Amino acid sequence: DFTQMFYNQNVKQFWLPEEIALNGDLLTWKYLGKNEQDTYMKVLAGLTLLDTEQGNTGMPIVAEHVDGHQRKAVLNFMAMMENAVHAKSYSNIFMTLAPTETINEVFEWVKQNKYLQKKAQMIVGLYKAIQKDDEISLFKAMVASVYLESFLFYSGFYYPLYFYGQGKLMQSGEIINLILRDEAIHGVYVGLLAQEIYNKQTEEKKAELREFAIDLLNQLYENELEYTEDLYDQVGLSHDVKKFIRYNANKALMNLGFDPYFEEEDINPIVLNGLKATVEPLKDDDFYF
């Protein structure tokens, strides 16, 4: 009911890194404090590292196990965007803002970071556990994918959106906004594929899959809180970032056809500024009473 519509929306959102000139960001970058520059670098590396997993494994593995030519094509398109567009865009932002030696050091740090690694390996673990012709293991991986696309990226997206909403780092913020817009549709699409599997299950199996999804969300959420304090306490933003994580967790759940887990909260206004019934024929004698 939905793949051709998503095909259309995906291909019409096509873009390339070269379209946004990045050099003019240096005019606001130079005015940020060391903690702001440090947080930005670390967040950026976090997003880069997670998105690489999605391009090399997450999207291609789902495309491999999903049946249907049109779905495979949409999934291929999404994998292309990760590897050919998003990855080059993150690299471009880095090369503009930091010298080569600084980039290498930030990636060394973030590569060793406990909270980034915990979430990266949790997601990758579920992708590696998919078994041929087993729709349960595929569903679990799709849940992981939706959580990455619609939830885990957002502790990171917060900061570029925060600057973007203030008039700072506008060129890289525009790039991030385009990336985020792609991840949003990726999350919604994979969510619909997961719901298709979920709806084929018994009531007991459904309850079991719900417990899986909530348990996974809880593990990731508790690590996100630690990840958040680790990066954002030094710039005083953690309270507001936490509200943004929960709001996006609720969107991820809704993508999977589940109820929101967290109470509704308002979001930081600067970040906001940055951001069929069954047809049954009439059988006659329905006109007589």
Partner: peptide
């Protein structure tokens, strides 16, 4: 949600 468009048509005709 369970009822069909035929039920809606029957309600309209009634």
């Amino acid at each position: 949600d369970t009822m069909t468009t035929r039920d809606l048509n029957r309600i309209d005709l009634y």
